[PDB]
Ligand binder design. Structure first.
Ligand code: CDL
Ligand code: CDL
Ligand code: 3PE
Ligand code: ADP
Lengths: 344, 42, 51, 96, 318, 47, 459, 120, 98
């Protein structure tokens, strides 16, 4: 990429979420969403492999129709209130549209089909951006409008996502898609507490970002899109085997690690609000997510899969190092739990 | 003797585009490692 | 110490343990002499019933 | 008034369209646009009968962003009938 | 080397000159290509890379002293010959390590070409490795899947690297090579069934040569033209480097290729793909031991610059 | 030693001085902030 | 209680920093002394529970265990010096640290005032244990065993998480002290009848009940000796400690909500005891012995009579020490024999004279010989169970007869009969093997002299 | 939640009102934890990059232990404020709307008949 | 078949180091890993520990209660009061319902 183009695109992919967050005029929030859609598509097809064009053409159609639905909500509001922004008075259907639409861009629940497929055809790098710096934008729009959205729908999309994400993940063996599925699940918890305590959504996101960003830079350190590929981690780079183990169990909710806090406080907030029906079912299938996380643990760490002689060759050569971010984001993530009170 | 490290066969299962292969799903084949399909002369 | 410093690591833990332990006592010092069962007037030359 | 319900249903009829592909990517990219026209018409209509001139900028910003959006959409389309010789969606089933 | 450097100068465009090309010379097991190579190199100052070896990677990395056989993948060309169609498959393991070695050599060559600007003569290349496997499968040496595994590695890694500019070639009929073998006597090299040598050349003649003819400049030389480096060198300086994929390599395109070869761990990333054919598999218990032992060699237990055994210093501030 | 000599043959004297020097600026600002802070807190409230 | 804990943490730095050759002695020698500091908690001249500080407390029920948890780390590290002496010097220092963290975590869990501190630390102990079982497990099936050990505990655990957050909203603090001195009386609704099950089920799972105990036979089979000692001696008892402190609340329901478990346990005691009678794997038989002798405990922590509780406290500490002793000697036979089969290796006393004395005393502890805390324990649970219903003696009476039979069968077909002709010749006994045993039984003899210390909260 | 409060500083980290609160003692266990959390990050880095774990980057080790800690004092300083605002806000309401939070008076046990469920 | 190692035999550590104590292969570490384990194990835990545990005084007050009973039984019997009256919390303190 002519480095100039790289700058323009990257600026847009970054001006995209930032305009959304900063503005209050919904319109300006919509174009922030629009710029993110335009900026991400070029990077998605960088290899320009036949799989890639498929990825982008899906991502784009799914993103575009949702963008149009979000605009329709703003256009309708403009007639029901002269304001260009959702208010207490807003017709309920107007808000529900925004939930569905925004739940498509974020890819939650019954609209979770595009994400796993686009996460499969894009590079590991652009995978991260597509999973974590593109969720900030839509979530911002929701978090702003939380007082007004429906508790019922969110919960249904929340629970569905948790289930779909979990069930989908169990079968998958491609890593990119295992992560895509996890993201659907975590995204679910996040949207469950939005109606009740938005501030916790912003924790269940950061922690997801501080967990997923190290996890993916791990997958690419050896650029392994297969579990079999990550399983030979012990030969290619032995040290990351320890933290890859804890980060994945952290992604699932197991108690000593940082990953428990988001689930724990979301459950505490939902019980405070009396959803002890919903919270219980979510926590239970949340346990399904750890099963596929630990199955990967087995292959990568607890058991040593057989490797190839040609690997000895890759050992010889100095391994290009993992950026510092890996460490700082691996530790702050695997073990901050002793510092939970301040985090919340 | 020595803790059983996984043999080739234990490894085999984790290959294939889906762990728990379905009736028609199994018919599929793992994605190309290069991420570029052999496709066709077109 | 010819690489025997390692030894102190654990012992030292005990000392800091007992120190931190005292700290808690210092913190939980209310009721020093207000415990009904043990409420007594300080005997001569004693400013603390239990330290 | 009713004028608005026709435009809104136009957008839903265009909605039903984009969500039900018929083997032609181009046609879809063309339906998608049918919405933008319906949104542009509705935004312009209410702005005009609310005499809200401060908002007319929007009816056009909507079109400017929608045009590029479509530009990107068509370049993907051209990219597809360069890799598969057709815009037919069925071809787009490699990511299964 | 990175975008930062490239952004500020450091362009392969500014470092290329007529003598700067990737020239490989390929022949049969004994085509005298070793000699022609050195000379062509001496002619244009081209860095002459030696044919890839079992321990070429070890000479490449760290100390450069030859590694123990098991550390270098336990491959014997010697055993290749004395025990063809071996139960353990040393011949396929030999071939797979050889492909990895030339992948490292070709990538090191491209890194020298784009950085220095000097050209490179690489003798046999990843592009001319398949002839040994084709002959081996034509013989009982390798089975069909073994072939597929090599082809898969070749399809995954070879396309990324740019093609040889020209591919100087020698030819000396099988009788010639067998006789040439007798002159340098080595029990192992000596016992190479002719038909196998027949299959090696046949592939170049039929597959490799025309293949590259369309892609790169093809200069085939009869033994007599050979042993006359001057004449061959002359002809290279004569051919016009036009036809080929190299024409589109703009500076902003070279940068990415450079950053690849600059990273050896990636060059052969797909060489270790988890396809479990039995010959290739290390095996966890044996592989773990070989690793604990290769990683404990002096200067290898830590990254270059940080292992004190070989005399590295300043580790406490690095 | 190393045929391909290690890129990190010796420390990046700059990387030491901005790593060491940066940390010593952190403390001198941090410790300053605390005592300064304590004061304001003490005086802001009665003492 | 930060001397039983901080000095413990510092063990981790010592296992890592210390020389590869001297790593074993620094760690084992120091934790022996760590146990000596643990003995200070036993100084309770008065009734008042010793609330060290806000989060850390030790009452009669926890104190007898914290000392056992600290005591076994030395022993665990002495029983695993053989296997795990074939490792790379960084696999060892990981195993040693894993064992160290278990008692750090277990010491805190047994010494925790806030019930959810129990939960977080409670369910954390699975991480160290699963690594010990899966990473170093000899058999092909430990991946499976690990899954069983993680899911059975985890599915039970999330209900307890919901329940404890639930009581915090209902009462306003999960502090065991307050919860005790506050009025929390459930109201026998249909919902409460569920709360009770939510709180007890997670504890009932790791305390193998007849219905959910399949995890323990599978886990101890492939687990390394140190993991099997930890699971039997401290890990299973985590479930019992939890049931004692959690049933302070949910006071009214267990009067009638316990019948299901009580009957599950007493019938379970008979069947688990009986299948020990014909099980070919010795480690298998000890594990089911552990299920049955722990089925007695869930049937005393539910009858809830003063005697039951301290019968339970007596038996849990006693059976913990005895089981390990049995699992430790089983390993010594396994390492020389190289097979878990009970039928092979017959006649050992002929070739290992003393280990057989340790085998005999361990079996007599296993069955109820009378001048042992093991018998006092069962005698007491038996008494209360009889009080609950005189008929209980029949079922707690078939178990005693069966328990005698399998305990002696382990001695009769492993340590008597004609010697096996020529298995790989059995090298003589190391002094470590014998001490690891002596260290288990000498405390069993000393505790039996003064049973008062391990009697529980009730008495 | 706490946003929308009167006087809210729209983008400020810790409003000066937080001056009134005591400063976090530099050795507060938490800041000390952050320190250890940091040292470990450093050590971990060395490990992943294959350097002598403890004897390398002794400059970095310092940057880490000193970056994390620096961050702590100024974060905790805030989180401490946020919690303190919460009381100011909470306690105030209890009063301004007194009737809703009425000080009840329990009866002594002598009067309260608590049910006795006999264990028997 | 894949490459993997041939089964490693287990050494008769008692063949060399005929004084093997079971802790480590080289002899001096062996001796110094039992001279410190029997000592810290038996010599100052089973001995000093049992000494200290034996001398814990009146554990859980059961040495105090066998006297307090004796004075109470001394006082109650001589003054004619019932040795264990039948209600503990005095009836007067209780405020029964109506
Ligand atoms: C619920 C919690 C459960 C926790 C346990 C379970 C969860 C964690 C599991 C981790 C392992 C999972 C399985 C991973 C795969 C294992 C097999 C494998 O492939 O490993 C190969 C892998 C090969 O790596 P290597 O090249 O040999 O690396 C050498 C090591 O770094 C070793 O280097 P070395 O020994 O040569 O260097 C010595 C150095 C070694 O340094 C390290 O390795 C540090 C690692 C930190 C990991 C933290 C994980 C959490 O010693 C030190 O740690 C520093 C000591 C001096 C500074 C002390 C600072 C003050 C400490 C005060 C006390 C701290 C504790 C109490 C808190 C403070 C008081 C309140 O083996 C490992 O190194 C494992 C590294 C991680 C060990 C973590 C142990 C944590 C124990 C708790
Ligand atoms: C490091 C070795 C010691 C370095 C000393 C440096 C100089 C110094 O400041 O010492 C004097 C200084 C004097 O403190 P002080 O003001 O007398 O404090 C007395 C308080 O009663 C004691 O203060 P506190 O206990 O009230 O501290 C507040 C807070 C402080 O928070 C913590 O430090 C939690 C540490 C958890 C470990 O405590 C808690 O957070 C309570 C919950 C703790 C459990 C949280 C979860 C535990 C498991 C988490 C596992 C995470 C890794 C998983 C890996 C897989 O000692 C310290 O504050 C630092 C002691 C070491 C703290 C941990 C460092 C790691
Ligand atoms: C397997 C291990 C054992 C699992 C036990 C699960 C038991 C059911 C979940 C926990 C039940 C429970 O916590 O009981 C009390 C709870 C609240 O009941 P209640 O007092 O009416 O609360 C309303 C206050 N205004 O009532 C409930 O939470 C009832 C919830 C029932 C359905 C929960 C989802 C079950 C999924 C399986
Ligand atoms: N794929 C391969 N399989 C087996 N041997 C190979 C392969 N590629 C190269 N060689 C070895 O390379 C050697 C080249 O012969 P040599 O006389 O050393 O150099 P030159 O080929 O220049 O004459 C041959 O002896 C042959 O064994």
């Amino acid at each position: 990429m002519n480095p100039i183009t790289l700058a323009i695109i990257y600026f847009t992919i970054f001006l995209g979420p930032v305009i959304t967050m900063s503005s209050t005029n919904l319109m300006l929030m919509w174009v922030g969403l629009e710029f993110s859609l335009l900026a991400i598509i070029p990077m998605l097809i960088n290899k320009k492999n036949p799989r890639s064009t498929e990825a982008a053409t899906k991502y784009f159609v799914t993103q575009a129709t949702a963008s149009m639905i979000i605009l329709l909500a703003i256009v309708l509001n403009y007639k029901q209130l002269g304001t260009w922004m959702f208010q207490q008075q807003t017709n309920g259907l107007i808000l529900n549209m925004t939930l569905m639409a925004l739940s498509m861009k974020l890819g939650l629940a019954p609209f979770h089909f595009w994400l796993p497929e686009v996460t499969q055809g894009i590079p590991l790098h652009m995978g991260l951006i597509l999973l974590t710096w593109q969720k900030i934008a839509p979530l911002s729009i929701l978090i702003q409008i939380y007082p007004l959205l429906n508790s019922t729908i969110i919960l249904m999309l929340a629970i569905t996502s948790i289930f779909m994400g979990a069930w989908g993940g169990l079968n998958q063996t491609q890593m990119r898609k295992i992560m895509a599925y996890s993201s659907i699940a975590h995204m679910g918890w996040m949207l469950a507490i939005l109606p009740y305590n938005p501030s916790l959504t912003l924790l269940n996101l950061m922690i997801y970002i501080i967990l997923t960003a190290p996890m993916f830079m791990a997958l690419m350190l050896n650029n392994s899109m297969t579990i079999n590929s990550i399983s030979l981690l012990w030969n290619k780079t032995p040290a990351m085997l320890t933290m890859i183990s804890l980060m994945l169990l952290s992604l699932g909710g197991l108690p000593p690690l940082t990953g428990f806090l988001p689930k724990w406080i979301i459950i505490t907030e939902l019980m405070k609000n009396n959803c002890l029906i919903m919270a219980t079912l979510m926590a239970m299938m949340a346990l399904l997510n750890l099963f596929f996380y630990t199955r990967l643990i087995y292959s990568t760490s607890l058991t040593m899969f057989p490797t190839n002689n040609n690997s000895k060759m890759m050992t010889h050569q100095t391994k290009t190092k993992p950026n510092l971010m890996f460490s700082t984001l691996a530790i702050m993530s695997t073990m901050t739990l002793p510092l939970a009170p301040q985090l919340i | 003797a020595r803790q059983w490290q996984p043999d080739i066969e234990w490894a085999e299962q984790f290959s294939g585009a889906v762990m728990y292969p379905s009736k028609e799903t199994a018919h599929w084949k793992p994605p190309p490692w290069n991420d570029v399909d052999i496709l066709k002369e077109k | 110490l010819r690489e025997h410093w390692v030894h102190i690591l654990v012992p030292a833990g005990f000392v800091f343990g007992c120190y931190l332990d005292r700290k808690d006592d210092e913190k939980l010092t209310a009721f020093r002499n207000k415990s009904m069962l043990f409420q007594r007037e300080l005997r001569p030359n004693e400013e603390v019933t239990w330290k | 008034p009713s004028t608005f319900f026709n435009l809104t249903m136009a957008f839903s009829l265009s909605l039903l369209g984009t969500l039900m592909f018929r083997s032609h990517l181009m046609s879809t990219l063309l339906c998608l646009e049918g919405m933008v026209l319906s949104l542009f018409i509705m935004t312009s209509v209410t702005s005009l009968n609310s005499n809200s001139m401060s908002s007319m900028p929007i009816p056009i910003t909507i079109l400017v962003f929608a045009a590029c959006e479509a530009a990107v959409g068509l370049a993907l389309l051209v990219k597809v009938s360069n890799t598969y010789g057709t815009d037919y969606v069925q071809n787009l089933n490699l990511l299964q | 080397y990175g975008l930062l450097a490239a952004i500020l100068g450091d362009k392969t465009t500014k470092k290329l000159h007529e003598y700067s090309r990737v020239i490989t010379v390929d022949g049969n097991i004994c085509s005298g290509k070793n000699k022609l190579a050195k000379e062509i190199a001496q002619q244009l100052g081209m860095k002459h890379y030696p044919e890839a070896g079992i321990q070429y990677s070890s000479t490449t990395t760290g100390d450069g002293r030859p590694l123990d056989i098991e550390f270098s993948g336990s491959c014997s060309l010697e055993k290749f010959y004395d025990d063809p169609k071996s139960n353990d498959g040393n011949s396929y393991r030999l071939q797979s390590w050889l492909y990895a070695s030339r992948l490292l050599q070709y990538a090191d060559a491209l890194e020298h070409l784009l950085s220095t600007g000097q050209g490179v003569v690489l003798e046999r290349s990843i592009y001319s490795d398949f002839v040994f496997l084709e002959a081996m499968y034509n013989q009982g040496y390798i089975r069909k899947q073994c072939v597929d595994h090599y082809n898969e590695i070749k399809r995954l890694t070879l396309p990324e690297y740019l093609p040889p500019h020209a591919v100087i070639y020698i030819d000396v009929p099988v009788p010639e090579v067998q006789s040439r073998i007798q002159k340098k006597g080595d029990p192992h090299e000596m016992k190479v069934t002719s038909a196998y040598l027949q299959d090696i050349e046949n592939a170049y003649k039929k597959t490799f040569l025309p293949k590259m003819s369309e892609m790169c400049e093809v200069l085939v030389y009869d033994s007599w033209e050979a042993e006359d480096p001057t004449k061959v060198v002359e002809d290279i300086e004569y051919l016009k480097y036009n036809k080929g994929p190299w024409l589109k390599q703009d500076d902003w395109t070279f940068h990415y290729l450079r950053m690849l070869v600059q990273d050896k761990t990636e060059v052969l990333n797909y060489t270790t793909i988890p396809v479990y054919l039995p010959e290739i598999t290390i095996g966890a218990h044996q592989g773990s031991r070989i690793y604990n032992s290769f990683r404990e060699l002096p200067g290898r237990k830590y990254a270059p610059g940080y292992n004190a055994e070989v005399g590295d210093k300043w580790i406490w501030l690095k | 030693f190393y045929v391909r000599e290690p890129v990190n043959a010796k420390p990046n004297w700059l990387a030491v001085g901005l790593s060491v020097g940066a940390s010593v600026f952190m403390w001198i600002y941090l410790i300053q902030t605390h005592n300064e802070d304590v004061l304001e807190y003490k005086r802001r409230n009665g003492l | 209680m930060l001397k039983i804990i901080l000095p413990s943490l510092m063990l981790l730095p010592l296992t890592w920093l210390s020389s590869p050759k001297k790593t074993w002695t620094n760690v084992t020698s120091y934790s022996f002394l760590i146990s000596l500091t643990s003995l200070t908690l036993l100084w309770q001249t008065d009734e008042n529970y010793k609330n060290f500080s806000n989060m850390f407390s030790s009452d009669p029920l926890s104190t007898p265990l914290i000392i056992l948890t600290a005591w076994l780390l030395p022993l665990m590290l002495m029983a695993s010096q053989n296997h795990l002496k074939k490792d790379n010097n960084v696999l060892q220092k990981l195993y040693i640290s894993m064992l160290i963290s278990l008692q750090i975590l277990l010491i805190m869990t047994f010494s925790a005032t806030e019930l959810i501190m129990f939960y977080i630390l409670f369910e954390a102990t699975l991480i160290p244990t699963l690594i010990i079982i899966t990473r170093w497990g000899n058999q092909t099936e430990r991946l499976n065993a690990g899954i069983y050990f993680l899911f059975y505990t985890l599915i039970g655990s999330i209900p307890l998480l919901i329940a404890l957050i639930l009581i915090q909203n209902h009462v306003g603090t999960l502090n065991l002290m307050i919860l005790s001195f506050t009025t929390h009386t459930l109201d026998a609704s249909w919902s409460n009848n569920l709360l009770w099950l939510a709180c007890m089920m997670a504890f009932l799972i790791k305390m193998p009940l007849y219905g959910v105990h399949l995890w323990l036979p599978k886990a101890h089979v492939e687990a390394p000796i140190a993991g099997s000692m930890i699971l039997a001696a401290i890990l299973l008892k985590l479930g019992s400690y939890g049931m004692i402190r959690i049933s302070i609340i949910l006071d009214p329901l267990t009067k009638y909500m316990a019948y299901p478990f009580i009957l599950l346990s007493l019938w379970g005691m008979i069947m688990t005891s009986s299948i020990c009678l014909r099980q070919t794997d010795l480690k298998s038989l000890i594990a089911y012995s552990s299920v049955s002798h722990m089925a007695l405990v869930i049937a005393s922590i539910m009858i809830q009579t003063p005697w039951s509780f301290m019968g339970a406290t007596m038996l849990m500490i006693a059976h913990g020490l005895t089981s390990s002793l049995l699992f430790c000697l089983a390993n010594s036979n396994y390492e020389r024999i190289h097979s878990r089969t009970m039928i092979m290796a017959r006649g050992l006393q002929m070739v290992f004279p003393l280990m057989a004395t340790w085998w005999l005393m361990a079996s007599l502890a296993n069955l109820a010989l009378p001048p042992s805390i093991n018998l006092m324990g069962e005698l007491f649970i038996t008494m209360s169970l009889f009080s609950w219903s005189n008929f209980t003696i029949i079922l707690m009476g078939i178990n005693i007869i069966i328990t005698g039979m399998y305990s002696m069968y382990m001695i009769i077909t492993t340590q008597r009969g004609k010697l096996t002709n020529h298995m790989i010749n059995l090298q003589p006994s190391h002094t470590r093997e014998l001490t690891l045993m002596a260290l288990h039984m000498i405390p069993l003899i000393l505790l039996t002299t003064s049973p008062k210390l391990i009697t529980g909260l009730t008495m | 939640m706490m946003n929308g409060r009167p006087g809210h500083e729209p983008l400020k980290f810790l409003p000066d009102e937080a001056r009134s609160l005591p400063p976090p003692k530099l050795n507060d266990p938490r800041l000390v934890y952050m320190g250890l959390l940091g040292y470990c990050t450093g050590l971990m880095d060395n490990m992943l990059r294959m350097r002598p774990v403890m004897r390398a980057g002794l400059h970095r080790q310092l940057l880490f232990v000193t970056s994390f800690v620096f961050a702590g004092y100024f974060y905790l300083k805030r989180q401490n404020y946020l919690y303190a605002v919460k009381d100011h806000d909470m306690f105030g309401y209890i009063k301004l709307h007194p009737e809703d939070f009425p000080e009840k008076e329990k009866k002594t046990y002598a009067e309260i008949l608590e049910p006795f469920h006999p264990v028997r | 078949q894949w490459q993997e190692d041939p089964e490693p035999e287990d050494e008769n550590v008692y063949a060399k180091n005929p004084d093997f104590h079971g802790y480590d292969s080289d002899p001096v570490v062996d001796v110094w890993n039992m001279r410190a384990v029997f000592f810290f194990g038996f010599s100052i835990v089973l001995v000093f520990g049992t000494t200290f545990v034996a001398y814990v005084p009146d554990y859980r007050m059961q040495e105090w209660a066998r006297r307090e009973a004796e004075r109470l039984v001394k006082y109650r019997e001589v003054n004619g009061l019932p040795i264990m009256e039948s209600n503990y919390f005095d009836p007067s303190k209780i405020q029964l319902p109506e």
